[PDB]
């Protein structure tokens, strides 16, 4: 089997959300599709499981009420659903395949997760889409551009259109008080190369259609 | 059921041997697995039934059990092996996992390169001011970035960010942002970040005066 | 050199709780009354016993959504409590529901394995609903050698050992790397213990 899940989602508290997971149209037989949640930095959490066949479902004692697993056996796809999302619900969501009720040897179980989906990132903040501001960090010399106050993740920063990749560090974004992200991208080049060579950081933030080139200054 | 993994972080030279532990609150009686996860990616099975390797998995990943003490062992660390390691019990549902064990690459100490950046005029013209301290290619990850403004130690008004360990020298980089209103920035003349790290002789301060 | 008591071979393998050579009419036999299907062929198979290890195949603990500990009768007694055969499991409904069961075992033991299960012929729509909730049940056991699918015959037969229903038991040999599949929404007597060969 090969599980594929729907794309990434950004939503505000109180909104409905239904992510999806297909890729198991034939199996044999008796198999569970489970939902696993993984919070930024934390370990992993089993939410529940479903048999796509006879639509039998077990929920974790931690999630029975919050969420709803479901199957449309027609198109052979499983759904995770919420009624009213919450900033807490912000996580990576995997679906995972394992065998239903198979045993072997001397009573041990055949119930480990055999196959995973790629992940579906779900984010709940909730500010609104806001494009970033792009500031020079002016100068073995070091220079950067600083990508401030945006939403949602992510941005992509390149330098000189990608012809420069040696010595570049794009730091993970950090959440601020405002619920907005700030990011820093820096690069080191020989000191003896300023004034001559042009340094431009290209910044992309598709959700707000931000496409910005900044010349990074000097003296 | 509760699985407690141990340790959470573990620094180990390439070539050597790592020993991850996981302990169960109850009996899972050998119904336990080990997955490996890398950044952005799903976990991939390594061990099932506590002892059996999955297909593809080399023989240097070993697994043993003493009733409730489960042991993963990786020998001859190649770079391919540095990631996060979870244990899971599938003895009964709700299936539970460990909290993780991050396996860090170990290298000889390396002292940071320290840079400091003034706010751009462009950013001031708005009305907010960001001063940035950059620490470059160091190891170990423990370093202390202290903001001093007019000698006065600052506190609770900066934010740090660290890169993931590097792939081609196993170092780290970090950036700290001191964020002040455009106001409160003019009433001050010197801005400095003092860095204290292991690979440094004494602390190291970079600094600048406005104009 | 192998010798029984006042257990029969059947009562023996199923593991009657009141427990070559057996007495032609033993005291303890099938607690619950019924028939042990394919009896004598099994007996012929069992005078060639070179190896015989009892091993577990599906833990009684692993029944989460059915009521395991309840398959007990005033007919299979042990220390003046109602009991039942040890080696199998008489699964009863839980919270007035009985979800279909889908279990499955793969024989990975290098050896042939002797597996034993059964079906409960309850005696009226009463006992049926009380014990399993679903009015219309089946049982479905399968390998690559066997295909069984059995409906319960609901009738009130003459009382034997206090019981107007009956229990039919079946058995099979499972070859190495063959899997057996169970599917049942009631009246299943589920294996817990099987035998090596
Ligand atoms: C037991 O059955 C009742 C009947 O509807 C249901 O309300 C209840 O949630 C059930 N409890 C469990 C633990 O399934
Ligand atoms: C039983 O397990 C073995 C070993 O894992 C496997 O090769 C075999 O195909 C399995 N049998 C069935 C019927 O699935």
Residue numbers in the entry:
A (entry chain H): 2 to 140, 149 to 228
B (entry chain L): 2 to 212
C (entry chain A): 49 to 67, 79 to 256
Q: Which text from the study accompanies this structure?
A:
The HA1 subunit is primarily responsible for binding the virus to cellular receptor sialic acid, while the HA2 subunit mediates subsequent fusion between the viral envelope and the host cellular endosomal membrane. Structurally, the HA1 subunit demonstrates a globular while the HA2 subunit adopts a hairpin form composed of two antiparallel alpha-helixes.
We then went further to generate the complexes of F55–271 with the Fab of 65C6, AVFluIgG03 or 100F4 and determined their structures at a resolution of 3.0, 3.05 and 2.8 Å, respectively. Figure 2a shows the structure of F55–271 in complex with the Fab of 65C6. Superimposition of this complex onto the A/Anhui/1/05 HA trimer showed that 65C6 bound near the membrane-distal end of the HA spike, just on the back of the receptor-binding site (RBS). As a typical heavy chain-dominant–binding type, the contacting residues buried 642 Å2 surface on HA1, and 662 and 42 Å2 surface on the heavy and light chain of 65C6, respectively. Among the three complementarity determining regions (CDRs) H1, H2 and H3, the 22-residue long CDR-H3 was dominant in the binding by contributing 66% of buried surface. The conformational epitope of 65C6 consisted of 18 contacting residues from loop 121–129 and β-strand 162–171 in the receptor binding subdomain, including residues P125, S126b, K165, R166, Y168 and T171 that were identified through the random mutagenesis study. The long heavy chain stretched parallel with the β-strand 162–171 and the loop 121–129 of the F55–271, forming hydrophobic and hydrophilic interactions. For example, F104 of CDR-H3 formed hydrophobic interactions with the P125 and R166 residues, D55 of CDR-H2 interacted with K165 through a salt-bridge, and G106 main chain atoms of CDR-H3 formed hydrogen bonds with Y168 and T171. Finally, the 18 residues within the epitope demonstrated a substantial degree of sequence conservation with an average of 91.9% homology among the 1,663 sequences of H5N1 HA from various clades and subclades currently available in the database. The strong potency and breadth demonstrated by 65C6 could therefore be explained by its target conservation compared with those of other mAbs. In contrast, epitopes of 65C6 and 100F4 were located away from RBS and their major mode of action would therefore be expected at steps after receptor binding.
